[PDB]
Ligand binder design. Sequence first.
Ligand SMILES: COc1ccccc1-c1nccc(COc2ccccc2C[C@@H](Oc2ncnc3sc(-c4ccc(F)cc4)c(-c4ccc(OCCN5CCN(C)CC5)c(Cl)c4C)c23)C(=O)O)n1
Ligand SMILES: OC[C@H]1O[C@H](O[C@H]2[C@H](O)[C@@H](O)[C@@H](O)O[C@@H]2CO)[C@H](O)[C@@H](O)[C@@H]1O
Length: 516
Amino acid sequence: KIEEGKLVIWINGDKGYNGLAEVGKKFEKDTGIKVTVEHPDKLEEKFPQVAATGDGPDIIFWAHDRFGGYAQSGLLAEITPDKAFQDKLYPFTWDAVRYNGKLIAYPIAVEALSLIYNKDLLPNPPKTWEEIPALDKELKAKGKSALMFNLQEPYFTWPLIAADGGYAFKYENGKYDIKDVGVDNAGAKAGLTFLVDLIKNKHMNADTDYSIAEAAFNKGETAMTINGPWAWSNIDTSKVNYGVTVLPTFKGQPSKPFVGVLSAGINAASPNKELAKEFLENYLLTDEGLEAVNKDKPLGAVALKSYEEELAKDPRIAATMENAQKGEIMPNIPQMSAFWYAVRTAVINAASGRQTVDEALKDAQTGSELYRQSLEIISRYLREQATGAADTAPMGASGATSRKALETLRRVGDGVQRNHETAFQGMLRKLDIKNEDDVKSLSRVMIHVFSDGVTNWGRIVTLISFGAFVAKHLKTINQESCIEPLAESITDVLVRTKRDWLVKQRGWDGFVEFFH
Ligand SMILES: COc1ccccc1-c1nccc(COc2ccccc2C[C@@H](Oc2ncnc3sc(-c4ccc(F)cc4)c(-c4ccc(OCCN5CCN(C)CC5)c(Cl)c4C)c23)C(=O)O)n1
Ligand SMILES: OC[C@H]1O[C@H](O[C@H]2[C@H](O)[C@@H](O)[C@@H](O)O[C@@H]2CO)[C@H](O)[C@@H](O)[C@@H]1O
């Protein structure tokens, strides 16, 4: 479906897309291949939908956090640069784009938020978040405000939520404990409560978004903002005497921004993969290519060592790296999209007063844990049904919920398979499942049948029960390796299509209560 002999690129509208188009024109001059750069709204949400049907751009740019989910869905081509090329970029940038041992994108630049301040209003920035209410009172008396930043995207509030101990997925001993989510701990509550109190005390407004905060800072109305390197170009045009510095501390601890590596992935459905690799390696990831993008909107600390050696001399880049070192590189696990949606809703609801901080972060914790919790129950049920023996591994975090949900699923799911054996057997025979490809075909039908019907626990149990019925068949035909992917497929469609309803039921605790 993607046209051969051209390149279509998607990049966010806050990045240097006109500079990127200049690199595309240089590519066309040599090869005669036209390069079209687009910046659609919500491109990070559109890409997984359109690429799943074989459509979409040839190349997608986004921070690396979204790319593990795309790679898990088979939407990205593996990238295999030679050693000479790999050595030109910092190794930690390649680490950001590695998923299941394979490189799935080219790293471009390292982005971290910093505190940006107007030196003409505030010659010295505040070192702590705690002093911002008094600074706002002093500035309000002269017709100014202390701080405005985007409150609609959780990326900007995360540094404050993480400062006193909030975390997305625990990281210790060089590994993630994906079962350990920290969005509703005391640290996360303290940071979000601080933000909500700034709004309650009229130091900030819940409706402030990217455009509003940018306009206020660039017009000299607010003394400070929180933003990344891409914002510096518009501040330069405004002529505000600005500085870029370390984010304020909270409870004496540094603010911890989630660090993104802007990366370029190649669509697995592209018939232009070799053209895309040539464009990215030999035109974009060069001093001249990155300089073209950087001159339109600054990239941050670029992954290309030769160019970064020059950019690192800029005090704004040193401040960006200082904030990056105090924060953490984002995970790229497929559940990052769910974590971001959950925290986005939590911040918006707490800031507006729709939910208290406790209610908001409890829902965010449920939403963030949903995939792993659902897979634990569904995988265990399918495998024990297929083999006749249960998994001996400990349940882990939220073990009581997992154990009680599995006990409930055994009672209700066994009843579904018993009573509906006729239709289940008839469907299993019509599907003629013999291998991995037949399981993938079953999964596509399963998605639309499940999604279009009514949302209730009885239909959710039927979906999972049919999965167990298929798992028994897979065991019989020596295709036991197909059971875990089937469990992942069932988990995917459940948590993706029914996300809001599942969170509203308190997840699997609601299921246990419903069938008590
Ligand atoms: C109060 O209610 C409850 C309380 C406790 C527990 C359960 C319930 C409950 N509450 C609600 C419903 C049901 C039982 O529903 C069924 C039980 C058995 C069969 C059907 C349905 C309808 C149901 O189906 C599904 N529900 C949810 N997710 C999925 S994903 C999926 C599915 C579909 C195709 C695939 F390839 C793979 C998977 C189906 C599905 C839908 C229809 C199906 O058969 C239709 C008849 N065919 C069979 C084949 N034969 C040759 C011709 C006649 C079958 Cl077998 C399946 C598995 C499906 C529904 O849509 O409501 N139970
Ligand atoms: O707000 C959640 C959002 O955060 C990050 O997105 C950043 C992006 O990394 C920056 O390059 C810039 O565009 O600002 C975005 C925030 O508006 C994550 O990369 C993204 O996945 C997540 O949804």
